[PDB]
Amino acid sequence: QESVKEFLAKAKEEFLKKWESPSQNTAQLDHFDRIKTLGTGSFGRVMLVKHKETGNHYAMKILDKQKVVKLKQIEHTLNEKRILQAVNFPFLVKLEFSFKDNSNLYMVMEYVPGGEMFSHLRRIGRFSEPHARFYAAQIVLTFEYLHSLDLIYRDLKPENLLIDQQGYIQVTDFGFAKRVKGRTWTLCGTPEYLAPEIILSKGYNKAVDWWALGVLIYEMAAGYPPFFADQPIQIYEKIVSGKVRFPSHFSSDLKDLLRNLLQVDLTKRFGNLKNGVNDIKNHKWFATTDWIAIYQRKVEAPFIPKFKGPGDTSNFDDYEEEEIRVSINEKCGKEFTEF
Numbered sequence: 057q058e059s060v061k062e063f064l065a066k067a068k069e070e071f072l073k074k075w076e077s078p079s080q081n082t083a084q085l086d087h088f089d090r091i092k093t094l095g096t097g098s099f100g101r102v103m104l105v106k107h108k109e110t111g112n113h114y115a116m117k118i119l120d121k122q123k124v125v126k127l128k129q130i131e132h133t134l135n136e137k138r139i140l141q142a143v144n145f146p147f148l149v150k151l152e153f154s155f156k157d158n159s160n161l162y163m164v165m166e167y168v169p170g171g172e173m174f175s176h177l178r179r180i181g182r183f184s185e186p187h188a189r190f191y192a193a194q195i196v197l198t199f200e201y202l203h204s205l206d207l208i209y210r211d212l213k214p215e216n217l218l219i220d221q222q223g224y225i226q227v228t229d230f231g232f233a234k235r236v237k238g239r240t241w242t243l244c245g246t247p248e249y250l251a252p253e254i255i256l257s258k259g260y261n262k263a264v265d266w267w268a269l270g271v272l273i274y275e276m277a278a279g280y281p282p283f284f285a286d287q288p289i290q291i292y293e294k295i296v297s298g299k300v301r302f303p304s305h306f307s308s309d310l311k312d313l314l315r316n317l318l319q320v321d322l323t324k325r326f327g328n329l330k331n332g333v334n335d336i337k338n339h340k341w342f343a344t345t346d347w348i349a350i351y352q353r354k355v356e357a358p359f360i361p362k363f364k365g366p367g368d369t370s371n372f373d374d375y376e377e378e379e380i381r382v383s384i385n386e387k388c389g390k391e392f393t394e395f
């Protein structure tokens with residue numbers, strides 16, 4: 057419909073203006089109080105912080121420059137910040153500030169207190185099809201938005217989907233997101249969610265996100281992912297094989313959609329055909345979905361996370377609390393000039 061076409065045209069205009077003139081240096085570390093580590097990885101962490109003047113809470117991602125360099129994530133880190141400061145969509149966590157110092161890079165995001173979908177899914181076991189469908193619809197709209205901007209996301213998994221106070225999804229972690237008009241080649245993403253063409257070291261495209269959506273919908277509705285095995289090499293063998301087993305409790309419509317998203321041949325995969333995303337939106341499994349009402353956040357969510365207020369961390373887990381040290385000397389200044 058022309059209304060969707062004009063929406064996406066405006067979305068791309070607004071993205072490009074910020075893309076071509078990125079914001080930089082919009083806060084500093086001593087404007088915030090550190091509260092609690094919410095997650096950690098090989099080159100950084102995410103911490104709940106509170107702004108000292110406004111009292112607002114944020115999730116601050118802190119990346120160690122020297123580790124980013126050592127683990128060959130420079131371009132990915134520059135992609136992450138440049139994309140986040142340019143996008144705007146109801147189901148994406150919002151970047152509020154960014155800055156750097158002698159040691160670290162900082163991306164200060166809205167704090168979503170309801171926790172990761174991964175926690176809720178593993179607690180309940182599996183989501184009913186209507187519950188899975190509510191979340192899947194949000195990812196479909198989000199990928200329609202990102203792909204129309206020539207952005208591939210490349211990190212879909214339950215850990216990256218935060219549940220907000222209204223029960224809606226907020227996608228976090230743009231560390232693998234990239235502006236790509238055609239193909240791209242980097243090996244990245246978690247093993248269970250990789251498309252076959254990533255595993256086979258091909259030049260791949262945005263069809264890998266639609267494969268990952270198939271994995272996510274399967275895992276939400278089953279409680280475990282479709283290509284599960286003990287070690288990555290065994291997972292990769294199952295992914296490239298072109299066979300899946302569906303639980304008998306899956307509806308026929310759900311199985312049909314999944315066979316079309318988990319299509320090994322990327323030229324036959326839903327989302328990547330002539331009709332693009334509309335083959336997904338018009339599929340029978342989504343017949344009950346009001347796409348506009350989802351976008352407008354007018355649908356009552358299936359699940360509202362339990363939390364006490366905007367500073368509650370009970371839906372996140374516990375990690376060793378480490379210093380945020382800042383060297384007296386500048387590290388890796390050249391590499392991160394544009395940040």
Ligand SMILES: CS(=O)(=O)c1ccc(O[C@@H]2CNCCOC2)cc1
Nearest residue numbers: 094095096097098099100101102215
């Ligand atoms: C890219 S990084 O190395 O900076 C990094 C920071 C934070 C991370 O958080 C996840 C969140 N889920 C809870 C467990 O922690 C892992 C992961 C990686």
